[PDB]
Design a protein around this ligand. Structure first.
Ligand SMILES: CC(C)CCC[C@@H](C)[C@H]1CC[C@H]2[C@@H]3CC=C4C[C@@H](OC(=O)CCC(=O)O)CC[C@]4(C)[C@H]3CC[C@]12C
Lengths: 60, 37
């Protein structure tokens, strides 16, 4: 399923930029857990990982 | 840096998340109640 992964990765990175739509989830079973996982992914990427990068510069 | 991230994640982030959850749910419920079909 290399092609599916290749397409989805572009879509996921675009969603990470803040632009796009998660229309691909129609084929997924148990959509709730996928929503939760994407929620936590966004939270980690934006709140914790990005903030720590901010903090490091200030202290150095 | 990993130790600091783990420290902040558990102590401060627990309090912040617990503070935000009830506030968000209640405020959104209020907005939903405001609307009438
Ligand atoms: C956050 C940092 C540390 C990681 C860097 C992010 C990259 C690994 C991501 C961002 C955008 C992604 C790309 C988005 C689009 C494509 C084209 C894709 O191949 C295609 O041409 C089919 C899809 C299309 O044509 O749009 C293969 C993966 C690639 C390079 C994706 C692979 C991974 C990329 C480079």
């Amino acid at each position: 399923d290399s092609e599916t992964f290749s397409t989805f990765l572009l879509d996921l990175f675009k969603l990470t930029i803040g632009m796009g739509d998660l229309e691909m989830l129609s084929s997924t079973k148990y959509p709730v857990v996928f929503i939760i996982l994407l929620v936590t992914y966004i939270i980690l990427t934006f709140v914790l990982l990005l903030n720590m990068l901010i903090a490091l510069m200030g202290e150095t | 840096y990993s130790i600091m991230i783990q420290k902040i994640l558990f102590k401060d982030l627990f309090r912040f998340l617990l503070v935000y959850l009830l506030f968000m749910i209640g405020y959104a419920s209020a907005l939903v109640s405001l609307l009438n079909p």
